[PDB]
From a paper:
Nucleosome assembly requires the coordinated deposition of histone complexes H3-H4 and H2A-H2B to form a histone octamer on DNA. We recently found that APLFAD is intrinsically disordered and can bind H2A-H2B as well as H3-H4 with high affinity.
The structure has overall pseudo-twofold symmetry, where two APLFAD flank the octamer, tethering H2A-H2B to H3-H4 within a histone half-octamer. APLFAD makes substantial interactions with both H2A-H2B and H3-H4, covering ~800 Å2 of histone surface on H3-H4 and ~400 Å2 on H2A-H2B. The regions involved in H3-H4 binding (residues P459-D471) and H2A-H2B binding (residues D482-P487) match well to the NMR results. The interaction is partially electrostatic, with an extensive network of intermolecular hydrogen bonds. Overall, APLFAD makes use of multiple known histone dimer binding modes: the cap-anchor and the R-finger interaction for H2A-H2B, and the aromatic-key motif for H3-H4 binding.
Residue numbers in the entry:
A (entry chain A), B (entry chain F): 16 to 118
C (entry chain I), D (entry chain D): 26 to 101
E (entry chain H), F (entry chain C): 40 to 133
G (entry chain J): 459 to 487
H (entry chain E): 459 to 474, 482 to 487
I (entry chain G): 36 to 123
J (entry chain B): 35 to 124
The structure:
Amino acid sequence: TRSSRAGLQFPVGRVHRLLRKGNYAERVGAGAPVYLAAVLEYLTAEILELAGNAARDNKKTRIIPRHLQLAVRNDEELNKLLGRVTIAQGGVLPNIQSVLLPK
Amino acid sequence: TRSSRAGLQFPVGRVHRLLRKGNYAERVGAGAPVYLAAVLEYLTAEILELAGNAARDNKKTRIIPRHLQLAVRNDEELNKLLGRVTIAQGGVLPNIQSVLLPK
Amino acid sequence: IQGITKPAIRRLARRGGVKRISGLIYEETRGVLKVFLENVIRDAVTYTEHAKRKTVTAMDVVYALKRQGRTLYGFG
Amino acid sequence: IQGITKPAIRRLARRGGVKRISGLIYEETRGVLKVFLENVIRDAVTYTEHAKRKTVTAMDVVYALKRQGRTLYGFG
Amino acid sequence: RYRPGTVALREIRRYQKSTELLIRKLPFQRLVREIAQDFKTDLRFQSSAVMALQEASEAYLVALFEDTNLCAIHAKRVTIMPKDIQLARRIRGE
Amino acid sequence: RYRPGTVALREIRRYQKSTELLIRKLPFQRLVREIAQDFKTDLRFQSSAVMALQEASEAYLVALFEDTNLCAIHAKRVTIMPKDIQLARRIRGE
Amino acid sequence: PNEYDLNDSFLDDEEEDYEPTDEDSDWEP
Amino acid sequence: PNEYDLNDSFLDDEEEDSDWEP
Amino acid sequence: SYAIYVYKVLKQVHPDTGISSKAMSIMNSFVNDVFERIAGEASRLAHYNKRSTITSREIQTAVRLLLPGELAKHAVSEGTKAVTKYTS
Amino acid sequence: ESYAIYVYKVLKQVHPDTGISSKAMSIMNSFVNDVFERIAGEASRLAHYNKRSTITSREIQTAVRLLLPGELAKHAVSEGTKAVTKYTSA
Ligand SMILES: [Cl-]
C-alpha cells in the first residue's frame, strides 16, 4: 500500500481522501497525504509513548484517559499544542501551590 | 445588477465569486451571496452610523480610525464582535479605574 | 441551579487546588456555571436546529464547544 | 532592546490607565515586548519564506498576527 | 483536634488524584433540562450529550478555580472570594 | 510641591485621548531589525510591515498594562509591579 | 445511585434499547 | 524627528491621512 | 476591495460625513474579516451536514453562531429580506 | 473520523505490552481529527494566500512549522520529509 511504501502505519489513502473531501483546495499534491499522514503518526506515537510511560510508572498495563492527560500536561510542547483541549476523564495534573504547603 | 435586484449596495456578484474561489464548498447557491452581502452591508451601516456619531460628537466632519474605535468600544454588541481586533490608530476608550481618582 | 450543591462546588475547587473557600463562592459559582451552560447550549441548539433535528447530540455539543474555543476530546 | 526607553514604556502604561509604576516594571516590559516581537516575526518570516520571498510585507505581518489570534485592521 | 489545613490539603490530594465527575449526575441533568427547555420547549438531549456538557463544564470550573486560587494568593490570601473569580474571568476575557 | 498622583492622572488623561504611537519610530525599527536579522541575515521588511508590527505591539502592551493595573488594584496597590504583569500573563495564557 | 435518569422524557437516546454504562473497557482489534 | 529611517538597507519599499473619494 | 460600497453606505447613513483614507482601510479589513468568519462557518456547517452546496441557510445559521444577540437578529432579518426581494 | 486500528498499530510499536482503553481510544481519535483539521486548515489558508490551487507537501510543511511548538515541529518536519522520500525510493 501507499502507507507501506512510506514506512507508515497511518492510512495514506484515507488522508488523501479526506483532504479532497474537506474542501481544502481544488488539488492535492502527491506528497501531501504522505507528509500529513507521517506527521499524524509521529504525533500519535509521541503521546502514546509518554502515556505508556505514565501508565507503566503507575504499574498499569493499560492506557486510560488519565494517562493521556498526564503525558500531555507534563510535556511542555504537547501541553502548548493541546492548550485549549479538554481530555474527558483526564483529571488534572496533581499540583499544589507551594505557599499552601506547610513551611 | 444582481445587487439592485436584492436591494443592496454591496456587490452580490463579487461576493458570489469570492465564495466560489474560496475553498468553502463545491457549489454555492444563488441565495448565499445575496444573504451574505446583505449582512456585510448591514454590519457596515451599524459601524458607520455609530462612528459618524462619535465624529460629530467631537465636532468633526470626517471619520478617522479614532471614531471607528470609539464607536466599536462603546457599543456592547460591536465590542463583542470586535473583541479580538486591533484598529490601528484607534487608541483606547478613555477610562480611569474609580479607585485611582480622588474620592 | 441550587441543585449544584456546596459539597460539589467545594470538590471542584479542591481539584483546582483551592485550600480555603469563602461562603460567598457557592452562589457566585452557580451564576458562572449557568452562564457557561446557557452559552454552550444556545449554540448546540443552533446546530441541532440547522440540521432540522429536535434532539441535541454529543456532536452538536462538541461543535458548540469548538465554536467557543473549548475543544473537547472523547465524544466523536 | 534598551532602545525602548523608560518614558516610552511609561507612556504606554499611562494609556493603559496605570497611576504608578515600580522601577522594576521597565525591564519586565522589555522582556515581554521582545517575546511578543519574536513570536510574531518568526511567523511572518515563515509566511514570507513559504512564498519564496525575502522581504516581509505588512500582509505577512497581518497573517502572523491573525495566526496568533490578534487580528489587526488597516493593512489590507 | 481541628487542623483544617490538614483536612483541606488531604481533600486537594484526593480530588486531584481522581477523574470522576464531581457534580452529581441527576442534578446536572436537571440543570441542563431547565436551560435547554427554556430555549426550545420541545427540545431533547441524548444522554451522551448531557455527559459531554458535564465533562466540559466541570473542566471549565476547575480551570477557573485554578486561576481564582492564584488571584487570591496574589492578594496574599488563602481563601478564595468572589472578587478572585471576577478578576480571573475579567482577565480571561469573559 | 510634589503631586505624583496628580501628575499621573494628567498623563493618563493625555495619553488616553491620544492615538499617536508612543514608542519612538527609529528605535522600534532597529529593534525589529535586530530580531529579524537574527532569524535570517538577508531578510528585509517593508516600512509598512514595521508600522503594522508597531501598532500591534503597542496595542498588546497597552492592554497588558490594563490587566496589570487590575492585578495591582486587586492587591490593594496603585503601583504596578512585575508580579502583576506575570499574573495577568498567566491568566491570559502566555 | 449517581446516574442520569434515563426515564426523563427530556432524554432521547438514539439506541434507546440499551442502557449506557460508565465503564471503560479494553480496546482491541 | 520621530520617523522611520528609509535609507536603512534593512527596509525594502520597492513594492510599496487624506479624505477618501471615488 | 469594498471601499466604494462602504462609501455608498456611509452616504446613506451620514450624508454630510466623510471618511479618511486610513479609516476606509479599517472598514475594508472589517468587511473581509466578517466575510471570512461567516463563510468559514458556513463551510463547516455544510460539511457537518454532508451537504455539497452552501445556501442561504448556511449563511443564516453562521450569522446566528457568530453574531451577538441583537446584531444577529437584525442581520438575519436583513439577509432574509434581501433574498426574498431577490427572488421576484 | 476513525483511526483507531492505526492508533493501535502505533501503540504496539512504542509499547508492545501495553493496551489502551476504549475511552482513551476515543481521545486519540479526537486528537488525530483535531490535528488533521488544524494542519489541513492552515495549509488551505497558505495556498489561498499564495493564489495557488493545490495543497502540496510544502503547504503541509509550512503549516506544521506554524502550528506545532518548537521541537515537535522539527521532528514532525523530519518525519514528514523522510516519509515522502521513502515513498518513492528503491
Ligand atoms: Cl442495557
